[model samples]
Target: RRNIVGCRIQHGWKEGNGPVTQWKGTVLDQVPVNPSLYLIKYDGFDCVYGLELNKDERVSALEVLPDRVATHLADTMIGKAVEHMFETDGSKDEWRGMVLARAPVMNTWFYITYEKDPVLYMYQLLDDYKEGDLRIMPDSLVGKQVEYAGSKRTGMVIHQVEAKPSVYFIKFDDDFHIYVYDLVKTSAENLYFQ
Candidate 1:
């Protein structure tokens, strides 16, 4: 329903949809099986809204906003620390760590994972190599500096397995790069600080 939203003419601009008509909302979704229909979200009152139709009309550039922008700005404005409580074990226990949002996204968007250990930047895990048959990720690494490994790396992981969960790469001593099935996380007490 591409232009259907704004195409409603004076009806759309006046009502509770002033932000959307000005192209200041995020296109949250589209109707299933309908390319023209869309669900857009804006800030402030009357934030959530919908649209319809695919008639020919002036297609203005929508000022789409990312969900993280609001969250990030709010946190930054308050000088908030980058911390998130993630599930560690299968039980009730949880761990504290900085929750890095995948940009404007997951996987390739994984920004960083930090506990008491040195923060792991997403770039630290990029590589061209593959793990081949080494695909078993451990589960105990959940809360510690390590991520859950139920055949896949969870929590704070470095030397990312480029292709699949079975393979992995990491820099053991700040610069030594190598591959291994088992990953031993550095203790928080021993982690060098900035």
Candidate 2:
């Protein structure tokens, strides 16, 4: 049986540029690491992301749906979407325009278009509805007490990781890393990081 993983992410970058708050995508792969983390690929964005399940949060992942069901969910609005493609050498290339559907970011060639005819570009959804709340403001949440979605583990942000947008490192009161804290990347929705 195919297992679908549900996700609700605001995203780490591009706030007003369009992104979804809650979405469901296929579980492309997962790591067996304790505190197991899941990697899902979705049309929500042309990227693969890590997800930690919160028992309290459940979104029904479908096994299959009818053509009409697919049609209704089709993105019909007109707009642009970001296309990220990596070169053979593992370099990254990006552009914003009208393009085809995107798969989750992964190393393998796990791609087949579900939304064959792309519509209502993902980028167009930018800041339209939830931008004000979806874009993870790295500066705002810093130094605040945040809890893990799965574990009740709590911590304070000590500093922001250097990057275009920014990521925070949280110091769990106790851990194996010692004096060192765990890295937490933030999306508009989840405060935890990878």
Candidate 3:
């Protein structure tokens, strides 16, 4: 059901170290000769290692950390406008683009086609973008307190309007009227009780 290529993985600790530590890497390619063997590039290392799946020894064992966010947003993020936070050589560049597709195997990465002159598609980590960059609102805000339009009148979010975009129904203690507001436009704060 899931593809292993391009997924982030951690390899078990190798022998001969004072303190054992797992190495993190990204699956680069699958070996043609062996279906269970894969080429991986360890983070912060220049050399790539071939890892065999289903190995018993601690050093050869592999643990895959599938990206949960990408899997959840795969279908919903298509065609959504986003800004990729591109950083290279200590310089930061914000590129505007729309999501073309969630990459296969590793859903945590996305394919974005730039809107600028080059107009080329680039695969980048999902972390490179933020919720605001993609115009995606918070999933839910129920039970949170929100101050109404700088009026100092605060209310509790009683319900979420699923049919609308980031709309929440809030109930103010001082009044009987239930107000509706968009999360993006409203100032929300968490409630705490002693």
The top-ranked prediction according to lDDT is: 3
| Alpha-carbon deviation at 109 in model 1, angstroms | 22
Candidate lDDT scores, in order, read 0.31, 0.34, 0.52
Candidate 3 lDDT, 87-154, residue by residue in tens: 56788677665554454344465544444522223354355444333443223567665564445566
Ranking by lDDT: 3, 2, 1
Flag the better candidate by TM-score, 2 or 3: 3
Residue pairs of candidate 3 with colliding backbone atoms = none
Worst 10 residues of 2 by lDDT: 112-121
Which prediction has more favorable lDDT, 1 or 2?
A: 2
Candidate 1 local lDDT, 1-194, one digit each (tens): 34333221222233343453554544434434345545444333222333442442333443423334322322221111233333354753322332233322112323333344333333111220121211212222211243333243332223333322422223232221121332244332232211
lDDT for model 2: 0.34
Model 1 local distance difference test score: 0.31
What lDDT would candidate 3 get against the real structure? 0.52
Q: Which lDDT tens digits does candidate 2 get at residues 1-194?
A: 33433332232322254652455445544433223445555554644434443321332332332222221122222122323332346664433323222223322222211123211222322232233311221224455665666666765554332322243334443331101122332222445533
Cα miss at 140, model 1 (Å)?
43
The model with the greater lDDT, 2 or 3, is 3
